[PDB]
Ligand binder design. Sequence first.
Ligand SMILES: Nc1ncnc2c1ncn2[C@@H]1O[C@H](COP(=O)(O)OP(=O)(O)O)[C@@H](O)[C@H]1O
Ligand SMILES: OC[C@H]1O[C@H](O)[C@H](O)[C@@H]1O
Ligand SMILES: [Mg+2]
Ligand SMILES: [Mg+2]
Lengths: 287, 287
Amino acid sequence: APRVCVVGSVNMDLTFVVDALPRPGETVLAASLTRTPGGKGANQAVAAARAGAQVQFSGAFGDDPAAAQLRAHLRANAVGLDRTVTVPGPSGTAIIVVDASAENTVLVAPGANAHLTPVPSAVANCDVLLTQLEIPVATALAAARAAQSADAVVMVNASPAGQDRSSLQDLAAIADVVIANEHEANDWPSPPTHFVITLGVRGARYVGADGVFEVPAPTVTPVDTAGAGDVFAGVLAANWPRNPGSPAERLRALRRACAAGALATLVSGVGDCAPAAAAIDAALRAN
Amino acid sequence: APRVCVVGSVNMDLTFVVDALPRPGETVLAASLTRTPGGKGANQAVAAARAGAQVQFSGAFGDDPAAAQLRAHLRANAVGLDRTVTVPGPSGTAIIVVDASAENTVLVAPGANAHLTPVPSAVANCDVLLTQLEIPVATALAAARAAQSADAVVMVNASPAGQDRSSLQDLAAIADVVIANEHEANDWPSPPTHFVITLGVRGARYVGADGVFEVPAPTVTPVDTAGAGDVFAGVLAANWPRNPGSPAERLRALRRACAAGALATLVSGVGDCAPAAAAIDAALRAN
Ligand SMILES: Nc1ncnc2c1ncn2[C@@H]1O[C@H](COP(=O)(O)OP(=O)(O)O)[C@@H](O)[C@H]1O
Ligand SMILES: OC[C@H]1O[C@H](O)[C@H](O)[C@@H]1O
Ligand SMILES: [Mg+2]
Ligand SMILES: [Mg+2]
């Protein structure tokens, strides 16, 4: 089974349903609050594990009750946690407010994610390192350097967008595979060996050492496209060939990631929408 | 020492500092996040206790880890808890967002607070009942009727606005004192004997049996306005005379509440910003 190390963020998502956002100086009561584990790194780790990889997650948890729910989520999804850190203070937290006109207003704090420090021994004997931009760039870069030493593929999800360009140059230079949507790709300083651009409904496109090509996604009727990007990245990591690989093996990985991303749109929420390897196979058979 | 009974809410607060408050549809990255005990009722009880009152709190805690921290916060501030209850499920959660101008918004998922039913001896042996509207209005109303039978002052912080109109009308019919900002005051059904309308930095406006006048606050450079209204209310409760009361005693309570509210804006944080009685005295001396 492929071995994947994910170095990245973990957050509790607090979803409040309200009539309207509170105005300055106002107190509003929510109809409901629902707490769900999330974060790019955690979601990608879960997707990788469900897709068949042996996964180790390195991330930082807070000292709050949220941290125990986040660890429980990962453990229940067969994600290894021996290389994680605990830091005093809140876990990463996202507040999602859904109002009467169905607008989603999102407020994010890094919390413990901002204090994630490298664990190079986590990459030891991994085939792929997968990281994203919701942890300190110095930590992502150090993980990528460790992966380089260990002959593991450096796979970066260039998300979220809007990061300082100069801050990403060293990481861009070291990345083997970069995964980005079209907007995110524009904020990435330089192209990697294998540049994977996700295209929502259209699947993905590739530009790199293997050529230039489109990778279609299966046609589906979406319920909720949230979380599909994290599923794509985790599945891509679970299927990307260990070095030096081949074009056939990378193409297979791409097809599987596109298919898994499509499947993920069929399920509400971000945390439980990752398909199993068997469902991915079936979705591809069905074409 | 005046005996203040607070019947109201207790929440764990997640306080986020931003440059600008998020607008609908927006995603915003917070500068900082703290997790601290609060809730309008808890905050008002703490402020009344720091201002020199002997305080009892009646409120509903959840049966969760948060509740231990919330209870300890109240005990640490000399607020009595023998009339509190534990209700199944989560303690309340509030989101406080504070922008560059020190303005704030508050969003509350009341949790256990929404299930507070009238506790028999909640208002036993008090001089002033202070209540707010995150708990059921029918529970506030029951406390008010009990307090009034024992000739205690009925003092209502009419926040949040938009609660159960029929119960509100019954509560409004009997309230001695209502504390509200201008928007909240507009929503309140009918005028109390003493309508105290808070005006942020301009202090407060009074409308009622004593006529119509304004009471200024000390001029300050603000840090965080969140929590200051609860400080104003708790200090007002701690200084309000027994019924029918004299105009001079009421004016003195208003002056002290205005000063304490101003002082409360000098401190980051919501649940821990109430000044000591001596600080209130000192700020009034300095004018
Ligand atoms: N409507 C859709 N139909 C089929 N596949 C989709 C659809 N939306 C997303 N996907 C899949 O998910 C991947 C990433 O999609 P994206 O829309 O970026 O996800 P997110 O909503 O999480 O940003 C795509 O490459 C694609 O495989
Ligand atoms: O007035 C501020 C308070 O309102 C909400 O009840 C929050 O818990 C916060 O502590
Ligand atoms: Mg989904
Ligand atoms: Mg304050």
